[PDB]
Amino acid sequence: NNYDGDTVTFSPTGRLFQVEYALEAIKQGSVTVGLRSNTHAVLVALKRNADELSSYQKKIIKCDEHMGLSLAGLAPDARVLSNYLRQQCNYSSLVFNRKLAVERAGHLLCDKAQKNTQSYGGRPYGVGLLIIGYDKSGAHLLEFQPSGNVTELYGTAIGARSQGAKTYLERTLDTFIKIDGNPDELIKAGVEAISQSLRDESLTVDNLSIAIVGKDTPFTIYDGEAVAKYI
Amino acid sequence: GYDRALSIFSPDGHIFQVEYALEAVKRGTCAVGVKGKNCVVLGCERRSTLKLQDTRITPSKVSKIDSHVVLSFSGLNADSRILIEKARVEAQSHRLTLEDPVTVEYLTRYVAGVQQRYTQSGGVRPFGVSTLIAGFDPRDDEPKLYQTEPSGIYSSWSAQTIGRNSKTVREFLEKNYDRKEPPATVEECVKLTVRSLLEVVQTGAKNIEITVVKPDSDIVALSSEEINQYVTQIEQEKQE
Amino acid sequence: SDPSSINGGIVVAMTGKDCVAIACDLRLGSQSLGVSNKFEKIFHYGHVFLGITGLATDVTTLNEMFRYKTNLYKLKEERAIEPETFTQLVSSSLYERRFGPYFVGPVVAGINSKSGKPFIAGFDLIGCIDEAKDFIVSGTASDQLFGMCESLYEPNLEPEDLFETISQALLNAADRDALSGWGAVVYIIKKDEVVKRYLKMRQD
Amino acid sequence: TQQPIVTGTSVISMKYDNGVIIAADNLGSYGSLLRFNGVERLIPVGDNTVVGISGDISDMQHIERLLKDLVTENAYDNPLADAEEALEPSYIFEYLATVMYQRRSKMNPLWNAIIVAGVQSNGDQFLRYVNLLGVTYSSPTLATGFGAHMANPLLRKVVDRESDIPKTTVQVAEEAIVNAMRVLYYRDARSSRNFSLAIIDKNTGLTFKKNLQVENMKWDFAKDIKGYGTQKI
Amino acid sequence: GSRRYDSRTTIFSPEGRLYQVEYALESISHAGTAIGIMASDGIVLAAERKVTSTLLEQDTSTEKLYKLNDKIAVAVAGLTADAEILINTARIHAQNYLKTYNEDIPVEILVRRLSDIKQGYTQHGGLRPFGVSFIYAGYDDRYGYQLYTSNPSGNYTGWKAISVGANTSAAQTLLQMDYKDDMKVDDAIELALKTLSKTTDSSALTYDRLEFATIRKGANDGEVYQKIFKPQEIKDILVKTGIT
Amino acid sequence: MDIILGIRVQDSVILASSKAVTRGISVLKDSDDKTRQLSPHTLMSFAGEAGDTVQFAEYIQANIQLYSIREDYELSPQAVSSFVRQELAKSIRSRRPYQVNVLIGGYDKKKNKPELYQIDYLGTKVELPYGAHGYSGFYTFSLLDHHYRPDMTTEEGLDLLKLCVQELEKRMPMDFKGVIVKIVDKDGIRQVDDF
Amino acid sequence: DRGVSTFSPEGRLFQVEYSLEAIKLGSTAIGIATKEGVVLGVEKRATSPLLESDSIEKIVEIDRHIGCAMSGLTADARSMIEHARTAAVTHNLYYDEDINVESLTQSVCDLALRFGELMSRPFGVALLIAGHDADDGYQLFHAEPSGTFYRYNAKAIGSGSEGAQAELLNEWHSSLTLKEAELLVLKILKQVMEEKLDENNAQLSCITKQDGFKIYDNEKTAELIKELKEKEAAE
Amino acid sequence: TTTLAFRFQGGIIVAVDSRATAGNWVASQTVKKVIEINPFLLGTMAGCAADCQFWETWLGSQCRLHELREKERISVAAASKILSNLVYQYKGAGLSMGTMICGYTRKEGPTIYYVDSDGTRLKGDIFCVGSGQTFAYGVLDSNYKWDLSVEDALYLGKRSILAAAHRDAYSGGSVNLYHVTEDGWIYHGNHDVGELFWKVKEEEGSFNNVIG
Amino acid sequence: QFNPYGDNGGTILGIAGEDFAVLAGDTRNITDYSINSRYEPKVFDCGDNIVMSANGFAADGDALVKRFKNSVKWYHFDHNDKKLSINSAARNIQHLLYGKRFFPYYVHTIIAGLDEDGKGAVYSFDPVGSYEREQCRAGGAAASLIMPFLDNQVNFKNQYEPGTNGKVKKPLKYLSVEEVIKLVRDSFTSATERHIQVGDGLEILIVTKDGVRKEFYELKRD
Numbered sequence A: 001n002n003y004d005g006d007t008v009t010f011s012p013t014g015r016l017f018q019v020e021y022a023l024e025a026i027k028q029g030s031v032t033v034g035l036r037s038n039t040h041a042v043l044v045a046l047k048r049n050a051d052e053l054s055s056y057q058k059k060i061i062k063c064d065e066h067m068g069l070s071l072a073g074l075a076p077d078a079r080v081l082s083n084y085l086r087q088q089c090n091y092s093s094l095v096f097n098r099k100l101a102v103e104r105a106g107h108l109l110c111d112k113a114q115k116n117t118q119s120y121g122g123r124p125y126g127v128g129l130l131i132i133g134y135d136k137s138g139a140h141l142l143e144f145q146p147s148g149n150v151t152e153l154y155g156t157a158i159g160a161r162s163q164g165a166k167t168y169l170e171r172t173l174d175t176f177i178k179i180d181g182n183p184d185e186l187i188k189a190g191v192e193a194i195s196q197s198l199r200d201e202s203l204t205v206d207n208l209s210i211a212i213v214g215k216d217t218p219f220t221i222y223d224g225e226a227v228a229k230y231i
Numbered sequence B: 001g002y003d004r005a006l007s008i009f010s011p012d013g014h015i016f017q018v019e020y021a022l023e024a025v026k027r028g029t030c031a032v033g034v035k036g037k038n039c040v041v042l043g044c045e046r047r048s049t050l051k052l053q054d055t056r057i058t059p060s061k062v063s064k065i066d067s068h069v070v071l072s073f074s075g076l077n078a079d080s081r082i083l084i085e086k087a088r089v090e091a092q093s094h095r096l097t098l099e100d101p102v103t104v105e106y107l108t109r110y111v112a113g114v115q116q117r118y119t120q121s122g123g124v125r126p127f128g129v130s131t132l133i134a135g136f137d138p139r140d141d142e143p144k145l146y147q148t149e150p151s152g153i154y155s156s157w158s159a160q161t162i163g164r165n166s167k168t169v170r171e172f173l174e175k176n177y178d179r180k181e182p183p184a185t186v187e188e189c190v191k192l193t194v195r196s197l198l199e200v201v202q203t204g205a206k207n208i209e210i211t212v213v214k215p216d217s218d219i220v221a222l223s224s225e226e227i228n229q230y231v232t233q234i235e236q237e238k239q240e
Numbered sequence C: 001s002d003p004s005s006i007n008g009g010i011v012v013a014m015t016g017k018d019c020v021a022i023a024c025d026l027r028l029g030s031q032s033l034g035v036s037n038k039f040e041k042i043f044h045y046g047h048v049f050l051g052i053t054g055l056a057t058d059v060t061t062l063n064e065m066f067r068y069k070t071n072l073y074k075l076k077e078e079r080a081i082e083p084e085t086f087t088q089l090v091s092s093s094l095y096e097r098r099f100g101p102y103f104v105g106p107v108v109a110g111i112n113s114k115s116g117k118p119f120i121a122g123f124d125l126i127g128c129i130d131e132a133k134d135f136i137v138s139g140t141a142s143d144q145l146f147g148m149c150e151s152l153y154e155p156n157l158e159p160e161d162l163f164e165t166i167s168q169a170l171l172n173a174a175d176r177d178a179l180s181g182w183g184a185v186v187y188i189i190k191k192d193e194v195v196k197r198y199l200k201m202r203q204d
Numbered sequence D: 001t002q003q004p005i006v007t008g009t010s011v012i013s014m015k016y017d018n019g020v021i022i023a024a025d026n027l028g029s030y031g032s033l034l035r036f037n038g039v040e041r042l043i044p045v046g047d048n049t050v051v052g053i054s055g056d057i058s059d060m061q062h063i064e065r066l067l068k069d070l071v072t073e074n075a076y077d078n079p080l081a082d083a084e085e086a087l088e089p090s091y092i093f094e095y096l097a098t099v100m101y102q103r104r105s106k107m108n109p110l111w112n113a114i115i116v117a118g119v120q121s122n123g124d125q126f127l128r129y130v131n132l133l134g135v136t137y138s139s140p141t142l143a144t145g146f147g148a149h150m151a152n153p154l155l156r157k158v159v160d161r162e163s164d165i166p167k168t169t170v171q172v173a174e175e176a177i178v179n180a181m182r183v184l185y186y187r188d189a190r191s192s193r194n195f196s197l198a199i200i201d202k203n204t205g206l207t208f209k210k211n212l213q214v215e216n217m218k219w220d221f222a223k224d225i226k227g228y229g230t231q232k233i
Numbered sequence E: 001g002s003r004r005y006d007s008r009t010t011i012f013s014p015e016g017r018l019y020q021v022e023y024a025l026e027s028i029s030h031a032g033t034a035i036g037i038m039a040s041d042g043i044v045l046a047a048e049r050k051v052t053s054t055l056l057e058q059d060t061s062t063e064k065l066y067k068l069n070d071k072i073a074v075a076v077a078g079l080t081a082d083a084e085i086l087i088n089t090a091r092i093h094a095q096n097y098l099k100t101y102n103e104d105i106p107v108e109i110l111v112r113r114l115s116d117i118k119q120g121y122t123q124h125g126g127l128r129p130f131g132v133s134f135i136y137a138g139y140d141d142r143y144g145y146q147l148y149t150s151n152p153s154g155n156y157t158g159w160k161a162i163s164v165g166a167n168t169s170a171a172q173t174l175l176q177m178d179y180k181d182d183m184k185v186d187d188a189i190e191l192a193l194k195t196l197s198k199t200t201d202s203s204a205l206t207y208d209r210l211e212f213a214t215i216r217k218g219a220n221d222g223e224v225y226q227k228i229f230k231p232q233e234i235k236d237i238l239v240k241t242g243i244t
Numbered sequence F: 001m002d003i004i005l006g007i008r009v010q011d012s013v014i015l016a017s018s019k020a021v022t023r024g025i026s027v028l029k030d031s032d033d034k035t036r037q038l039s040p041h042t043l044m045s046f047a048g049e050a051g052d053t054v055q056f057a058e059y060i061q062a063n064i065q066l067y068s069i070r071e072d073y074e075l076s077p078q079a080v081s082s083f084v085r086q087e088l089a090k091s092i093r094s095r096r097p098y099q100v101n102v103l104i105g106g107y108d109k110k111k112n113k114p115e116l117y118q119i120d121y122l123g124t125k126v127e128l129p130y131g132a133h134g135y136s137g138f139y140t141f142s143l144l145d146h147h148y149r150p151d152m153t154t155e156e157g158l159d160l161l162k163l164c165v166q167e168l169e170k171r172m173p174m175d176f177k178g179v180i181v182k183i184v185d186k187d188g189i190r191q192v193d194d195f
Numbered sequence G: 001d002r003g004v005s006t007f008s009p010e011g012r013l014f015q016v017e018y019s020l021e022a023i024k025l026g027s028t029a030i031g032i033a034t035k036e037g038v039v040l041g042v043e044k045r046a047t048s049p050l051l052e053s054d055s056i057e058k059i060v061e062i063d064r065h066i067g068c069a070m071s072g073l074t075a076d077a078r079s080m081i082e083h084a085r086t087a088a089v090t091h092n093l094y095y096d097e098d099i100n101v102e103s104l105t106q107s108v109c110d111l112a113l114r115f116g117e118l119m120s121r122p123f124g125v126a127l128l129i130a131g132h133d134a135d136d137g138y139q140l141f142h143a144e145p146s147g148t149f150y151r152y153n154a155k156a157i158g159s160g161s162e163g164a165q166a167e168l169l170n171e172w173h174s175s176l177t178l179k180e181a182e183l184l185v186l187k188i189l190k191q192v193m194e195e196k197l198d199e200n201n202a203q204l205s206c207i208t209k210q211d212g213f214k215i216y217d218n219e220k221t222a223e224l225i226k227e228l229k230e231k232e233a234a235e
Numbered sequence H: 001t002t003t004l005a006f007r008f009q010g011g012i013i014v015a016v017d018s019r020a021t022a023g024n025w026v027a028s029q030t031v032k033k034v035i036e037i038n039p040f041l042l043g044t045m046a047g048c049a050a051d052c053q054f055w056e057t058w059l060g061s062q063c064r065l066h067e068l069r070e071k072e073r074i075s076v077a078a079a080s081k082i083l084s085n086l087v088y089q090y091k092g093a094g095l096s097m098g099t100m101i102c103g104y105t106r107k108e109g110p111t112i113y114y115v116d117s118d119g120t121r122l123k124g125d126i127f128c129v130g131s132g133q134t135f136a137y138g139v140l141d142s143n144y145k146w147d148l149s150v151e152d153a154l155y156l157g158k159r160s161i162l163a164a165a166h167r168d169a170y171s172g173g174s175v176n177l178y179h180v181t182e183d184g185w186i187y188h189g190n191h192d193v194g195e196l197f198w199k200v201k202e203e204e205g206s207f208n209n210v211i212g
Numbered sequence I: 001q002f003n004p005y006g007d008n009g010g011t012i013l014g015i016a017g018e019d020f021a022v023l024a025g026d027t028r029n030i031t032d033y034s035i036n037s038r039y040e041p042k043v044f045d046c047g048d049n050i051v052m053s054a055n056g057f058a059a060d061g062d063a064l065v066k067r068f069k070n071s072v073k074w075y076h077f078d079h080n081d082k083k084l085s086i087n088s089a090a091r092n093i094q095h096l097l098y099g100k101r102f103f104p105y106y107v108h109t110i111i112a113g114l115d116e117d118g119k120g121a122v123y124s125f126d127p128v129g130s131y132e133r134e135q136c137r138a139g140g141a142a143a144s145l146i147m148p149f150l151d152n153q154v155n156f157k158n159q160y161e162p163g164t165n166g167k168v169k170k171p172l173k174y175l176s177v178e179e180v181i182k183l184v185r186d187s188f189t190s191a192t193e194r195h196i197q198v199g200d201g202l203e204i205l206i207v208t209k210d211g212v213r214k215e216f217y218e219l220k221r222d
């Protein structure tokens, strides 16, 4: 109200409204789902078009051979944050001959987002990210909020109507975590999860975006006829 | 450093600081540009609210940017000096590196670029100045006349006016200027320029300045008496 | 190579009874080659006189610098600078270039307008002041000038006697230096009149 | 650009069937003066890596602090710091090699020759060299300074190529290393009798031996040597 | 953060005016009147000190008339402290030019330089403008005797006769009435003092309330002399012109 | 570059400058014009290190042209020479100094007098009746000292200049491929196309 | 007042949303992508008859294989064009090849959100970037001041955009020829323009693999306008 | 190295050898010493190959930006000055370049500028740069005329490089010819000096000192 | 005084076939008269069907290869996983090298692969970035021993057809990958005999449309 003019101002109840408004941009964004087993981690993303002449906005970005994310909210902010992740993954490989742990990647994203919430002149990031990866401790899935809060999960969803997919994953938890050594079935579970967030529209061949990373699987993105198999 | 964003968008998609800079131009004395077949004439209004002025030393309204290009303006006088200085420096820089003087379009594009820059740089306000830039490209006999404004947009004109009551003199020029046959001589062009200012000026005494630019760096400013002869001839034809 | 002996030249200053005198040769050269016989090395800012020997570009540069500074001094102080004050200004200005100095040998001469006391001073290239009662020498023939001044000089000389003494000190010193000569000027300075005389000397 | 002041001589090492061995004497020379006699030049990093350093000792102590800080830093926000996300020999080496090359590129080198010896997570032997120029290389046997000239020839007689490694036991390897240290003591004027030896085995882990001495030395034959040619007495 | 307290000194009004420049001009309209009159054989600078006291040391006092160099002087209307900042900068500019070209700075070049400095404070930096208007009286060998004025906007113009400060409307009308082109310095001296005497807000115009200066080629032969009048000399010229 | 000469006569200044450009072993050009017009009545010839000469000359030219436009006024030869001297005096204590020697020949329209200024790369300025840079003066000054008069005509100046060039062509080891001669007077600058 | 980088309660950047309103006031620009090339067309919209309309430059070359049309505050586009040209040329210098149309567009869009308290405000202009590369063929992109860019088969921006886009919705198909696209841009421009469309107040351009980017002569466009008039009178 | 360029009636001829040496060791005989800046502009390589390659390729990028901005072909004067001003910034750092920037425009006609790493920029009709430049100059000077045909001019440039390649130890390999017209340059092939020498010897009757 | 450079010896060789390309190099690393390693790989697969070797000072060689591999990675990121063509990689490497023009990578770089028409390609660089496409190029210690042999046996220089006596050249018939590998092996065997820095092992990387293959051969260890 009087306390939402900038990110440097707490409200009388201790809230940061600019951060909350940045969080609101994610809710307007298109739905994207993340889930994993013990061998693989999967991202599923419903891409959004402007109209029938337009392309469908890409949602998934590769950060390294073993890591990548999906976005919901301001796409340019995702590009800034994903670029930063690419650099940090790269620094780890060049300097230490070491693949960047997914958990450490989450810590770096948290700290980068935090600096934009405590200083004058800046603004919070207006995007949410779902980071998947396979490192020395197996498969991982992270959820990033531009408040700075990063959380490690078995499965989750962000964007508009993400609550439907999140409830489904909460039911299916015991099933999909056991889908080891079967990439197709894990993706099926993700496609079925994101279907719980659809209204009026359904998953078409240029609508659907899928990514996977695993034990002997580099981070690869599937679009176009490569996802027709799962429709 | 002072970094405050003074030029910003409003809900209706307007940048008010740029629009208010135009209002400063509206207040400025009238300037007019008319290109003939082999010349360009720049006419300028001098408000007669200031007498006891020393006209020898008082800053003249038309300024040479190079030997072949001139610049006149409407709006804040102090602001115009900064644009004129920058344009003059760039003109010499161009000669130094390209080994050829600036084209009129290039010089216009540069000045317009400076004006635009001051509409989305932090800690600065836009220039309260619109300019008329006229001359001839090196080794070219085609007349050139351009206009710039605070926003930084620029364009070429067969004839144009800026400043106070420029709506009236543009009205005159739009019905009196024929594109198929522009003022064929210096006389005709100067006459049409003085006529256009007489729609707005008041007394045709020391209120009208006229500068003629011809090809190959031939630039001359008309004196009071020379202009007075045009003023005399125009009204004697009008008494009919 | 040695910057202080590329162009050549000399300056000498003396005190007398209620007067001071400052003199210089007129030569400017490029080592062996004589370039100008009109290169005066004495300047004045009001009633304060400054002679400068050494590298000619620095001589010119410093004159322009002290004109600059004494002109501002006058505007702010509403009075002309005095010899004693100017001497400190020269010293300050030279030392501020301690590790990139002007290759010069300045000499100040004048009479304090209030006390009427005659004043001379000399400096090295970085500002060390030599405030002698008797005489100050500078240039490529400074050794020769020290020898001439030390024997010819006597205290409390009248203006017209001091003129002969300083003229003969310069002339005979310059004639034993390859890089000095080609003309000479002598200033005789009293509290409210200054005479400037060009001397006739050998042009080799 | 500098010059080394207090220095350490050869560091020698080799691979064997189940791991690696590395050794270095305990001397800190000050030119020809054998100034400091209790200098440890083998620095363990965790339980899987030992970094052997020769050259400038002040720079060695700096590197020692960098490695100590590396362990601290790796433990930050790392629940698997003593497990899957522990420092590997390859991580430690690449870090040092990066620093060494950066420093030489600023014309301000760490005046050292370094050998990183260890065993990786998968049990693989790790042995690689880096020096003040940022030059790196690996070999079944590695040695710095004088050791390169005198120890390598002896150690290469045990492991001449990659296929000799599985055939080489830890007893044979240690024996070869200890003999080489004796030979260096005979022939290097900047060596000492006292040395340290470390074994990193994939089964038995890190064994760090301090206060070892060169023994079984041959000197008796010196009594018969008289003059420099013609002297009989 | 800090934005909250920023007055934004360099913005246009909806009418296209610079708020701070306009308000600085309002400030200057309450300052003591300064008048400059240019004649064929010299220039006169006359200025009224603001309501003084009998205990003010006049002979060492200077609030209106300042020397920029031997050829150029200024009359000040507005904040004296602001004026001295600009005056010192102008003095340095004149010396920089003299060092560079070994010639005295032409009057207009000095005026343009100071006016550009004023302009900068209206366009960038977010600082308040200088609350000062100058009358420049000077001589150079190109245009001879010249009068200029500059104001907080950084705009400058040339004049035959001009006033700044208080009652400029009344003063300018009086000057416009009695000024002629063939006028001489002694006549201009009288006009300046008569104009101040009529426009002043004080009861009577006396020597202790005035600062006076002339720039004459009344310097022996082909040179120019600046004369900052002493209190007694202002008293004498007041009697000579028949005001006291 | 090599030989640049200057002579100030009654009503004009004459600058003579060699045409050769030699890059070590070969003479790459024999028609090089070692001069720049700074203003309608001011000419500057130059010689020194390759590249720096033209760079400096064109930099000065640009600055004087800028001044001319800004003020609608031509600076006096004295004012131009002072500006040039300061630039060189500034340059000599730079990271990499301009190794350029110049002669400035100008006609002062106010005083109706020709003026010749000699400035070396250190910023050493002198006004002279005649001048040179490098070794040119060593061969020519004895002739100029003998024949020069302040009331010489332009034609007499050119004849004395020819004698100087002839002495240079006789006693100088280097072939400088003749000289381009330019005259500066009240009407401006013109080139003598047969010399 | 309030931050330039402030979010609204709806999660939108005020300044970006306001710049979009400025673009709505801009003159119309239309692009149509075909398998034979991409066509770009603009409304010139001269403010007066004395303004020489061929000096209005709202279609611009970025490289031989990439063209660009603008709508909104067109002065803001100049630095965007400068950057695009530099990026195109720089990539060729570094890689001895043509830059991808998408990569060029992405480089331009990276400038967009570089504003705050960098430039003081977003750009008040939208761009239609059209081009060809070997990997993805003929392409048309819409670059916004939000930093977002969409690829389009056809797109209209400016004041007549929603009426034009509805028209492009019906008319575009995957088998359009270059000639059919040219007439289609002219037809829709004519529909949304205030003044009557001719060769002086409208401009066409295209990008083909063979000939690269070309701005059409007024004589060439005049013929296509005459061809349009006749085929509309044909039924 | 031997490079030349000369102006004539039909435009410009550019001729270069192909040899690169590191001391006495012949590193390459197939070096491209003409840099195709763009379809209208050519540059020659002498000095440091990298300095010439890098900065003349960069020059092409600057010339392309110029014509995008100004909608007009860049002049040879302006193109050459961009390069000379750039290398002048680096003066003292150690660049080694001796090049001829060659072009043919409407306003200028055929134009050649010798540009050099110590800042020199000279316009001229005939230039020859490299270790074998003196040999090439001899053939050029004695046979050059403005009214040469394109065919004869091409041969003259070819023959002048051959003269250098024969006598100069650090010149040889092959001859590359170019003809610069107003509509752009035209490549006139690679000519092995070994084969060319014998061919010229027989057909021309020259090199009687050499047994064949 | 500190010398930032060193010489690690080694010799490399790149040959471009009609539809293939090989880049070979010995595996010996040395300083002065000592052997550091008998097997230290010097030729690398850099992705996108490109092989690279930077011979000379090994620290600079490793740094350059590392930076180029990184450049390939970022090329994919920035340009939609576009394949980096051999000509584009060559121009990119020029810029990497020339960026250190005043403190050079003390190496002689060679890359090999296939061009966009599927034909064999080899590019050769000097330490400061000057480059050329070549058919045959040896680099390093024994380059002066190998190149004359290659001029003779690959390009058939100074070889004429019998009976014609110098009138007809031996025609330049295309060589198979097996034929090229023979010449490479014989080149390195000969170099090993007469150059002290050459020996221990020979590793060859062969590039075809099918990908990158390796072959290793022993060399004399003295």
Ligand SMILES: [Mg+2]
Pocket: C174, C175, C176, C177, C178, C179, C180, C181, C182, C204
């Ligand atoms: Mg003497």
Ligand SMILES: [Mg+2]
Pocket: C203, C204
């Ligand atoms: Mg003598």
Ligand SMILES: [Mg+2]
Pocket: I221, I222
């Ligand atoms: Mg051996």
